[PDB]
Amino acid sequence: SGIWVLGYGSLIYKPPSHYTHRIPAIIHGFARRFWQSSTDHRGTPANPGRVATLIPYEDIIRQTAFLKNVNLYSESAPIQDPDDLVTIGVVYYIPPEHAQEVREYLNVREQNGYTLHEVEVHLETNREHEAELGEALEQLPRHNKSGKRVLLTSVYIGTIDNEAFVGPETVDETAKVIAVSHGPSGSNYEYLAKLEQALAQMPIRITDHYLTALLETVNKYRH
């Protein structure tokens, strides 16, 4: 009926309108990296910034550089299956009356090179929301190849082929950009800090080692 929308970047802390559920989520099957350039928000055309995208398991395993980078920051290194990849984010439910607005959610945020995808995802959540997640899973009962319950969700992704994709990039390379860039929405550092704040408000303790190393390195450049 309605749609579930994954948030892994600014949708976490600047939500879509009219959601009726917002469930903190361990999202399996994707890694989140600041491998998308921003030219209208957190940088400029001549001096782009860096914003978040998600990379699916099937793309990670196809490039040695992606796989080594994911293994560098994963507690499950060397990863063996999509379930080994974890991105901490949220999932929103948008009722049918408003579902068609999903196709316009990027009009107020990072947007160049992002495309809308529908994917079945294995999610986990905290004790406070387990029952709510369980009800969500029971509406369109779906299971993956391993027998685990999955949720049909929409997500905006900067895929590996998009014009703004800049990966793979090391934390040092990305941090050097984040530490100096800004655009009409404010500094690229503020974008990173808001994401870190939003994840800290949402304890599930599962932590994002890539984002921690990225922020530590950006702080070293800013010091």
From Swiss-Prot:
Gene Ontology CC, one term: cytoplasm
Listed GO biological process terms: glutathione catabolic process
Enzyme class: lyase
Binding, substrate: 5-10
Molecular function GO labels: gamma-glutamylcyclotransferase activity; glutathione specific gamma-glutamylcyclotransferase activity
Catalytic residue list: 110
One Pfam family from the record: ChaC
Keyword Nucleus: yes
Alphabetical keyword list: Cytoplasm, Lyase, Nucleus
CDD domains per the UniProt record, alphabetical: GGCT_like (cd06661)
Keyword Transport attached: no
Annotated catalysed reactions: glutathione = L-cysteinylglycine + 5-oxo-L-proline
Parts of the chain that traverse the membrane: none
EC numbers, comma separated: 4.3.2.7
Localization: Cytoplasm; Nucleus
Record family assignment: Belongs to the gamma-glutamylcyclotransferase family. ChaC subfamily.
Function comment: Catalyzes the cleavage of glutathione into 5-oxo-L-proline and a Cys-Gly dipeptide. Acts specifically on glutathione, but not on other gamma-glutamyl peptides. Allows utilization of gluthathione through subsequent cleavage of the Cys-Gly dipeptide by Cys-Gly metallodipeptidase DUG1.
Other known facts: Present with 1300 molecules/cell in log phase SD medium.
Protein name (database record): Glutathione-specific gamma-glutamylcyclotransferase
